[PDB]
Design a protein around this ligand. Structure first.
Ligand code: YCZ
Ligand code: YCZ
Ligand code: CO
Ligand code: CO
Lengths: 381, 381
């Protein structure tokens, strides 16, 4: 069921912006850990006296890392005379965000046909405005509305190099890392109450519910017309034996926010080999692998899609596998990206649904919860 | 001239503590960039509900990275019932420090015979108290006094594993990196006025002035009895043609603070090869190399100490060389460690003065300022 009810034309995920206290160290760590190239900058060396922003790219994936300078550097400016390249930036908002939440995503940015129209229609349909539409160098238009917590949905549209005022970084510093990651597949929020969050976001976007197929989790996925923009949201289920990890998130994050980013790889094996080689030398750690029972139970479930060698290759890398009625999903989860048990990354590869590949092919791994319970108890034997 | 006037017994530099917004990403970046092993932790997994602290070690060098959790996690605690492993930590102080200064050094920590005595004698001699002496698990005593800006001099003494409450990190995560760095040689402050800063610090420590031999810099070095604890301080010289980099520091740092950390390497060539290999893949960048004239002028100055091959090896790595009347100094400087043009690192190796090697052998490279001016103009030809 796809009513295709988008209230304005949405294209693809454009970028994800992290608000940091020091953009340099987070960007360099992520670049090495994920194999993403330094591709653009806006900072003191480009005349930005307001914020330091560094863009990493891998395929179509764009990660932006931004931190405030001392307000004193820009004390003489006013909004008409700002040197910030992202006009929505606010020193106080940024410092308040990072002291409240620590390292996390401030903006989920989607590209649209007309950012001013998208903002207007959104606000007309219940969206809480965050930053009004602003036209940068007559070329790009940016506007922001509240999504959940202190996370914003950022609309970007081009009349026709990331943003104006960003410079291409010198080749020297730019080193061509690549572990196979290619695009953002979905971005997931954690909220206290799923109902009101869904009503709000579906209300101002027109995104529809993506149909799916005791873990402390209720969730639903909002999707654009071609289901390439996927925004799942989770709520906790209280009273369970093991404490809901959504509830732990809300407590350590000081409320709602972005929980995980799913990054599509063109070869999840190459990606997981390359990231795991770097786990203990500055990269990212992965959640503990499932017990070998899990992989001894995979033949009965996906033996038609993956060979005995590829299923073996799953076991060494700790990859999980799930399956829709339309496709198959390979997935694995990092440990939290920073100090707090809040944001983490998911690496995924989807197989099936070739018409190009349709969005959400194979689902989001909801069955891997139940299979992860049956794994453990069956192994305990 | 060494009066040996220490007002209490000082041993060696013990550790340097960075105050961060996310300790994880800074620690992982530094570990890869400098070849330092993850060696101890105090965080949620060890019962610390207050701050996340991660210790990197290379030889005797200890770098500690600390960031606050949400105050909500520890809202029920009081100082007698704290789960912080560093009792001086304060959420508000830490957030205020990082929003004011960005990433930087909060504590220069020296080991002493008796931290309570050192604190008492210091305060009796004009030191501004920061955190009174506290005995941790009847084993270690920590106390802090103001050094300059928001940097503290931290006294640590042991009756007899970093600090109580810190756990040894699992071997898995611990990967034995090592690029040859071995100990902290000196830690340098930038202040608006050198005179009052020196009078203050020499006043409460008894440290003496270490004798030395148009760059916008006046400086002096305070030293302990055996001159193994070296604390240089700089002030700007205004009115010069090129703006004093000390003044730029003060402006971007919002006042006085730690400018650079000099790390002694047992083989500066191995270190600089290994760090430079990683500059564009998550490590540290170095200041631009001097022009080849500089190395064409080295034979006439240090040809008695370094071979033609080692002087050639200087040129490829960009190493600078200076010389006292007692020894020779090899040195090089990183670009700033984070977003702001504030803190950076110096890598050094000293040759000469073997009695063990006496402190400050070869000086601090003050002549490399003048030789760096003569380099450029002579090259311009
Ligand atoms: C970090 C350890 C917690 S385990 C975890 N956390 N998330 C997930 C997802 C997921 O991606 N769900 C999802 N994506 N978009 N919408 N929704 C609901 C699938 C499977 C698992 C599994 F199998 F590991 F339990 N997850
Ligand atoms: C980052 C680029 C600025 S150039 C710079 N910045 N610092 C230094 C030092 C130093 O270490 N001085 C020092 N150490 N302890 N006390 N003092 C005074 C020596 C030589 C140079 C040189 F040659 F590059 F100009 N430096
Ligand atoms: Co997911
Ligand atoms: Co120095």
């Amino acid at each position: 069921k796809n009513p295709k009810s988008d209230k304005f034309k949405v294209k693809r995920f454009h970028h994800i912006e992290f608000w940091c206290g020091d953009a340099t160290n987070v960007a360099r760590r992520f670049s090495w850990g994920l194999g993403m190239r330094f591709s653009a900058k806006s900072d003191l060396s480009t005349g930005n006296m307001v914020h330091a922003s560094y863009l990493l790219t891998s395929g179509d994936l764009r990660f932006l890392f931004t931190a405030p300078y001392s307000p004193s550097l820009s004390a003489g400016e006013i909004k008409p005379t700002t040197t910030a390249s992202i006009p929505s930036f606010d020193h106080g908002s940024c410092r308040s965000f990072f002291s409240s939440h620590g390292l996390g995503v401030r903006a989920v940015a989607i590209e649209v046909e007309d950012a001013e129209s998208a903002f207007s229609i959104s606000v007309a349909n219940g969206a809480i405005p965050s930053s009004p539409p602003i036209v940068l160098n007559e070329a790009v238009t940016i506007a922001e509305v509240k999504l959940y917590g202190d996370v914003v949905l950022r609309y970007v549209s081009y009349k026709a190099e990331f943003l104006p005022g960003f410079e291409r970084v010198e080749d020297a510093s730019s080193f061509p890392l690549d572990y196979g990651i290619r695009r953002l597949d979905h971005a997931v929020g954690n909220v206290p109450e799923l109902g009101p969050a869904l009503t709000y976001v579906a209300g101002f976007t027109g995104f529809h519910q993506f149909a799916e197929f005791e873990s402390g989790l209720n969730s639903a996925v909002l999707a654009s017309n071609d289901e390439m923009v996927l925004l799942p949201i989770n709520e906790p289920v209280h009273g369970t034996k093991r404490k809901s990890q959504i509830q732990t998130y809300l407590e350590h994050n000081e409320g709602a926010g972005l929980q995980h980013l799913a990054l599509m790889s063109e070869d999840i094996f190459r990606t997981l080999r390359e990231m795991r080689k770097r786990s203990s030398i500055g990269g990212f750690d992965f959640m503990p692998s499932p017990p070998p029972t899990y992989y001894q139970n995979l033949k009965k479930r996906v033996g038609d899609v993956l060979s005995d060698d590829q299923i073996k290759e799953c076991e060494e890398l700790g990859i999980l596998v799930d399956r829709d009625d339309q496709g198959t999903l390979l997935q694995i989860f990092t440990k939290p990206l920073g100090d707090r048990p809040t944001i983490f990354i998911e690496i995924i590869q989807r197989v099936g649904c070739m018409m190009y590949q349709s969005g959400g092919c194979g689902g989001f791994g909801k069955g891997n919860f139940s299979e992860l319970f049956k794994s453990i108890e069956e192994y305990e034997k």
